[PDB]
Amino acid sequence: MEWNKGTYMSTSIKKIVQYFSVMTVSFHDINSLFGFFTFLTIASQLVSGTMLAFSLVPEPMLIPMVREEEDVEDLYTDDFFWLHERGVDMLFIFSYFHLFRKIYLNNFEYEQEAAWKSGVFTFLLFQVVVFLGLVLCCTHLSDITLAIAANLYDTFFAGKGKFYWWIFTSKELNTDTIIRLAYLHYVLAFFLAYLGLIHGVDMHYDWKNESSMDGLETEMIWFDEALSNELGAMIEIILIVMIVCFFMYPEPEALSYEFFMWGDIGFINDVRFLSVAPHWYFRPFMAWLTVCPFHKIGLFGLIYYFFILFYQPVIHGTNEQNNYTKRNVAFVSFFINRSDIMTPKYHSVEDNLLHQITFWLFLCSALYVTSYLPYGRFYNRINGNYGTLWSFMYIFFYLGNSFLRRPLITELYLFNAFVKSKFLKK
Amino acid sequence: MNVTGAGLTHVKDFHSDEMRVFRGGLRHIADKQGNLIYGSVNSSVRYYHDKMSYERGFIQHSRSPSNQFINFHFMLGGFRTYVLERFFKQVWYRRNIRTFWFPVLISYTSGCITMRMYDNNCYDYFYFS
């Protein structure tokens, strides 16, 4: 291993204790605590998952009956199941808010290079673990998700050979695959916790509250002065979530997206194909699959989403050349009579109106993609929704292309102002 | 030749005393002797805080919180001034709503229009009269 220079911080118990006992945190706001919120809900998820795993027998024909039996004969099994589900929801919300905050703050320089790849890898592992648990739910939705994952995995091998059998077997939820996926869920969840801990230890190099340097040298000690604020902000977030859920989700409701979970595998061999609906965090993926009916193009888009979520500092960055890289863009249309362009450098955040406009358009595009599920029946027959297609195209254009992330118009406008001012006052 | 650097260059080596126990006969080396090697993260965890800082004519005064207000400046100017003006106008509006009210309004209106058109197409599909 001659290409390895070592580890940034060797993970030892004594060194961890010392580092966390003399670690200091600069003055910040509530928008910069999503990472610790995610750590708290990850720990709660681990504990509640252990509690749940002490009662789940990995047999598809026994899981619903055992879940019913353990609810009435124990005091806290259903409480821990509710905790585990709400922790999944909070994990998704916090991770997406964290990613959006980093994208807005433009943490795409070589110093933020380390914290990006690890975070994206953690996000992929988190989504894989979520998929494993969703399959473990053992309902019709679990079967549909398993079938979709098996088909997408087989598309890699082009449908030749049963290369998926070691994990998915016959693409159904039989005892062998249930055992394999349950054990994989547990092990990968603990590995997820370790990876998140590594990523969170990789934070201290460049830690900021806002995009503006504050110039303050004194900072608070983490163990009490910052931990108390983190816990209090977590409490406030929980209170807001409770208010919104109480006043937004009356019980009972006329219709819900969870009615597709009534069907039990084995017990009910008839599937209501009309009301196929996943949880809200895979709703964008199902919407993309419905909008793009091509199997190869849909898989390409699904992979390309993570492919461009990763490589983000590569597409947008200083690249160690101090903004002397010559990029190829066709949008300039030879306005300045040149093909290659110097990368601009005056990409501020808190006062960049165009950057704020583009970022908020992207965020609202993501929200609209998440908002609803396209009804697969008569969807493309009635020409579908133009807004969904526009949102998908804008998301792909914004994340992939660099035309809007670091525009050249502001840079050239600033040089025009500079030249005019210097000509007027020699 | 029979010297450090072979008589050609200066080497700049050092003896760490990390793997040594005794200074003289049965005289132990100081416990914190290894911290005297400057610029080494293996000697202390405080070296991870590597902010650039240099100044020479600076004095700072800090006071014990036990001689200060428990809640200083909390409601100066009253509800109207403090809460309304400061919080809402100066923080909430000035730092958030100026930045996103226009794109959020555009996105919300366009999404509502597109959803209404899609629902109207669905209604035409379902109802023939």
Partner: peptide, 30 residues
Amino acid sequence: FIYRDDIGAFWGIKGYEELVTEVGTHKGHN
């Protein structure tokens, strides 16, 4: 972000246009 009420899809959830659904909860309060 806004959904019709006369298409039988309550709050944008589609798939239940073939039956009466909202009587207990939305249209009337049992």
